[PDB]
A paper describes a structure:
The [name] α (ERα) is a ligand-activated nuclear hormone receptor and a major regulator of cell growth, survival, and metastasis in a large fraction of breast cancers. Structurally, ERα LBD is an α-helical bundle, with the C-terminal helix, H12, functioning as a key structural component of the activating function-2 (AF-2) cleft that governs the agonist or antagonist state of the receptor. The [name] and [name] mutations are especially interesting because they occur at the N-terminus of Helix 12 (H12) in the ERα ligand-binding domain (LBD). Importantly, breast cancer cell-based studies revealed that the [name] and [name] mutations conferred hormone-independent activation of ERα and reduced the inhibitory potency and efficacy of clinically prescribed SERMs and SERDs.
To explore the structural basis for reduced SERM potency and efficacy, the [name] mutant ERα LBD was co-crystallized with TOT. However, the [name]-TOT structure was solved to 3.06 Å with four dimers in the ASU by molecular replacement. The TOT ligand and H12 are both well resolved in every monomer. As with the WT-TOT structure, H12 of the [name]-TOT structure lies in the AF-2 cleft; the conformation of H12 in the mutant structure, however, is altered compared to the WT. In [name]-TOT, L536 is oriented toward solvent rather than docking into the well-defined leucine-binding pocket found in the WT-TOT structure, and P535 occupies the space previously occupied by the L536 of the WT. The largest conformational change occurs in the H11-12 loop (residues 527–537). Instead of extruding toward solvent, the loop is packed toward the interior of the protein by 9.6 Å compared to the WT (V534 alphacarbon to alpha carbon). This conformational change likely explains why trypsin displayed a reduced ability to cleave at this region. Additionally, the tertiary amine at the terminus of the TOT ligand is observed in several conformations in the complex with [name] ER rather than the single conformation present in the WT-TOT structure. Together, these observations suggest that the flexibility of a glycine at position 538 reduces the ability of an antagonist to influence the H11-12 loop and H12.
Residue numbers in the entry:
A (entry chain A): 307 to 329, 342 to 399, 401 to 416, 420 to 459, 468 to 527, 533 to 545
B (entry chain F): 307 to 331, 336 to 458, 460 to 461, 468 to 527, 536 to 545
């Protein structure tokens, strides 16, 4: 549950991973939408999430879905200085031409991950963080959510330790990772805003959440 | 000033805080935005001078000083608001003479939701017994991290200062009796409350839509 050990955590999280998908606003809309159905399923497989209410499971996915899509998108693009929406569709920044500076922001985060040589294990933890931490703001599990988040913080450190960083680089990397989550909230917001020139609604979320 | 001990780094930052401002005022209407605009802009002038007092910040080039500040100001004001509101459950302390309960924010369409969010964050800081040293750390962390979407071997610099704060932030926690885990854990918690604040800051902007020249010359 949370009495998972940090290796059991990473084990779970890598196994939770949604498949790889293949295929203009229509392109990316249809694409997001599709990925959005798998995301619902991964959320379920995330340790600690299945513990919350439906009403709360749903709130959380309500609040995080777009950054979960972006940080994903940012991830698979690390190795293509180019956004690789799916193996078969891979756009450059010129191609963004009112969506250009969202792309610019994304390609920033993408290089910053390449620079940081981010790990699939580290990545995978960041995503669970975004799921739980996003909407965490009358007897409560916010307490619970907070516990699961601390588990993951420990899981993150634990990975860095295993990999043989010094205790100082551990707190340091953890920082520059959790800070990129800020950048990502932002691009997500700029995203939401531009999809008023939208949010997967409740009942549907809730019925698939089961 | 890259190398200077955690102790130094804290007092530097603690000793550079803008003054405490007072507001001016015939009971509230949507003339309250004007009221809050005003407070914003005065505060924003002093924030320029605090940016300059933050170690490493003047080392950056003028345009980057501006990029950073342009990108992080409302986020920097909100965290300040939040911070000073911590000792006053249920109300936002705009100025020492302008405590405002959430009810009052409902007198400007779309603001109550921001207010709610702020009061939540203010809660969370109190419940964490966030110390002033840690707050000062996070303010500077917002200045630095928010803009860091830009030769640019200046990013590298920004980053190393940022690590330097991290150290300083850890260092305090260490010195308050905190076991190693509890350190890594609280550090997470604070940096993760930084996301919450950008969110608020963006929400702020949108309902402030529905500047450069000034900051450049003002930053000399
Ligand atoms: C930047 C990529 C993107 C989308 C996207 C991101 C990652 C990914 O893996 C796939 C797509 C995007 C576009 C539309 C969108 O809304 C769909 C509405 N559905 C939920 C009914 C979501 C993401 C987008 C978002 C806002 C504006 C312009 C583009
Ligand atoms: C929530 C507080 C707030 C402002 C504020 C926050 C903290 C603080 O210490 C002082 C004020 C606020 C209001 C207006 C504003 O605009 C300034 C425009 N200038 C920069 C051109 C900035 C902040 C606000 C922001 C957006 C919409 C409604 C209210």
């Amino acid at each position: 549950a949370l009495s998972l050990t940090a290796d059991q955590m990473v084990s779970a999280l890598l196994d939770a991973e949604p498949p790889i998908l293949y295929s203009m606003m229509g392109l990316l809309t249809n694409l997001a939408d599709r990925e959005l159905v798998h995301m619902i399923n991964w959320a379920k497989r995330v340790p600690g999430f299945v513990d919350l209410t439906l009403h709360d499971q749903v709130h959380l996915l309500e609040c995080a879905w777009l950054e979960i899509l972006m940080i994903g998108l940012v991830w698979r693009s690390m190795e293509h200085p180019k956004l690789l929406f799916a193996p078969n569709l891979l756009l450059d920044r010129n191609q963004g031409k009112g969506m250009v500076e969202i792309f610019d922001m994304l390609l920033a985060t993408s290089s910053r991950f390449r620079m940081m040589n981010l790990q699939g294990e580290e990545f995978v933890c960041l995503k669970s963080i975004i799921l739980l931490n996003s909407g965490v703001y009358s007897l409560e599990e916010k307490d619970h959510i907070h516990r699961v988040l601390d588990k993951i913080t420990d899981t993150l450190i634990h990975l860095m330790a295993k990999a043989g960083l010094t205790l100082q680089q551990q707190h340091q990397r953890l920082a520059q990772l959790l800070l990129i989550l800020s950048h990502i909230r932002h691009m997500s917001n700029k995203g939401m805003e531009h999809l008023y020139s939208v949010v997967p609604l409740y009942g549907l979320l809730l019925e698939m959440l089961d």
